[PDB]
Design a protein around this ligand. Structure first.
Ligand SMILES: Cn1cnc(Cn2c(=O)nc(Nc3cc4cn(C)nc4cc3Cl)n(Cc3cc(F)c(F)cc3F)c2=O)n1
Ligand SMILES: Cn1cnc(Cn2c(=O)nc(Nc3cc4cn(C)nc4cc3Cl)n(Cc3cc(F)c(F)cc3F)c2=O)n1
Lengths: 296, 296
């Protein structure tokens, strides 16, 4: 079990550099539209974006891909993003949709600087709607994506800000900020994360499939009992036993046995480890475990 | 800190599917040459590769890029790889070199199946010359690479085998197997992994720069003394001190203090953690720490 990213080639071909005056960040070029964070039009300064938008000048923009400049034709503002119409369509536009992530969803970040990709990594949207990425100044507008089995790219995230805690906040392509954080320099404090119980169950199945079984409780707790316990101990509710059927069928271990195991392991591993982890891991989804173990 | 891969697009355009008889793995297409593990010509049985090569027939090969089949013109064997000449050059061959890794080198893996990339991740060549990837059956031939600052791709790894431990072994593009394992289905056991001290020093500097300093020793241990201790305690030598000077200056902490700190912490943290880790982390190189925190 290793956190991986899906290959980045099809997304690299969509990253552009967006400049407005002296401010530079990343945008995503699809068809004849570049989407980027609206912070690119912020003054050097609480930002009044409505006023910055009303006094915008199109000739103040510079949009470029690999040093080649695209002609800017028009700009509209949608929530926390801009949609910049350009006079040229991206001939490497992949088959794509736009998807809004939910907590517990895994996705890929292509970390970009000045319109050029530098790194790719997998992340999980947490219950407080932040991610734990690695970004420095200039990463604003870095895209997050998933690639479906048929090849369709789901565009799901545009990087916005780093919180005081180090957590990372982005928007979707409609302009909604995940978690409704402000795209402003401010002292906002995210609420505390819960452990993603769905991912912990997937992790324990992966441990069973790698021979690691010292932790397995003999007895069971049902979903209703676990969910009552989860609410009192910083865990999310578990969603439907039936979705784990493939891993339950391959291990002979029911979800209820793992729910009971989580209750035990919450109080500590006691000098032992599970796949090299010293506490429970909610980093991997059921789909990731199934893909990495079986290719499905 | 996040382990990440460099963008994979330029390598994706070189991945091919190589088939000989019923055996299918991955290769890398550069110019008019495909390099792949020689296991593709193994019979279905201790493999006599010299005999398999002498009886090889070019018509048994099939080589394709994204489902487009390439004509096979000639084949030579070089150590544990084949060099397959095809009837056209890859028009997307990136500027590139071949480089043989040394233990402690980080690089990127593009995990491929049937000539199609499915995931990308960063790894470190360990002192026992294995890596800890995530690979299932069909990953043979998956390439490892690094991208230089000037854009030159260093091709450095072709995936070969998974040992009983789960550890992964590959070759370089000259055909030398890392660690001189055999490209045979025999039982082989790698030597004990040593903690990469250079990476642990980088990790402790990252902690200091993040305000985590509960563990810091005022004691100093010089390089020579640390290296003698390291021998007897599962650690590599520390290679040098001066490369850390930028981080030593920002923190006011000498490398020799961090060597003393490693000796203080090598058995465990008690109940405490460092950047979320419950034991010392050797995942991150100095270059990665400096790049991810300062963009250098
Ligand atoms: C450490 N870190 C991790 N993620 C981030 C994201 N991020 C960013 O990359 N850049 C930001 N400010 C800018 C400065 C610029 C200087 N030039 C020349 N051009 C610049 C462009 C930007 Cl966007 N910010 C700050 C920030 C970005 C916003 F979108 C926002 F609404 C409020 C903010 F305070 C930033 O967080 N940094
Ligand atoms: C679980 N895992 C992780 N990494 C690996 C690497 N690996 C591999 O992907 N495939 C292998 N055997 C093949 C079977 C095939 C069936 N078909 C239809 N085509 C096949 C092609 C291969 Cl290569 N092996 C085994 C292996 C591969 C070698 F290169 C070698 F020299 C000896 C070996 F025993 C394998 O390890 N599996």
């Amino acid at each position: 079990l290793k956190k991986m990213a899906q290959p980045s080639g099809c997304v690299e071909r969509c990253v552009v550099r967006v400049c407005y005056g002296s401010t530079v960040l990343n945008g995503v070029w699809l068809g004849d539209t570049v989407t980027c964070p609206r912070h690119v039009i912020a003054p050097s300064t609480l930002i009044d974006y409505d006023h910055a938008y009303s006094t915008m000048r199109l000739h103040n923009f510079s949009v470029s891909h690999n040093g080649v400049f695209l002609g800017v034709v028009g700009v509209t503002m949608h929530g926390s993003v801009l949609r910049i119409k350009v006079s040229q369509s991206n001939v490497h536009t992949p088959k794509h949709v736009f998807k809004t992530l939910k907590p517990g969803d895994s996705f890929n970040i292509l970390a970009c600087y000045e319109g050029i990709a530098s790194g790719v990594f997998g992340v999980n949207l947490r219950t407080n709607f932040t991610i734990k990425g690695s970004f420095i100044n200039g990463a604003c507008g870095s895209p997050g994506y998933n690639v479906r089995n048929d090849g369709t790219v789901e565009f799901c995230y545009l990087h916005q800000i780093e919180l005081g805690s180090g957590a990372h906040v982005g928007s979707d392509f409609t302009g909604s900020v995940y978690g409704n954080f402000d795209d402003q320099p401010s002292l906002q404090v995210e609420s505390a994360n819960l452990m993603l119980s769905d991912n912990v169950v997937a992790f324990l199945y992966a441990a069973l499939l790698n021979g690691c079984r010292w932790w397995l409780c003999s007895t069971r707790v049902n979903v209703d009992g676990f969910n009552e316990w989860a609410m009192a101990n910083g865990y999310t509710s578990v969603s439907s036993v039936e979705c784990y059927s493939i891993l339950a069928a391959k291990t002979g271990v029911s979800v209820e046995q793992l729910l009971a195991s989580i209750q035990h392991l919450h109080e500590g591993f006691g000098g032992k480890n599970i796949l090299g982890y010293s506490s429970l891991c909610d980093e991997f989804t059921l789909a990731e475990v199934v893909k990495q173990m079986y290719g499905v």
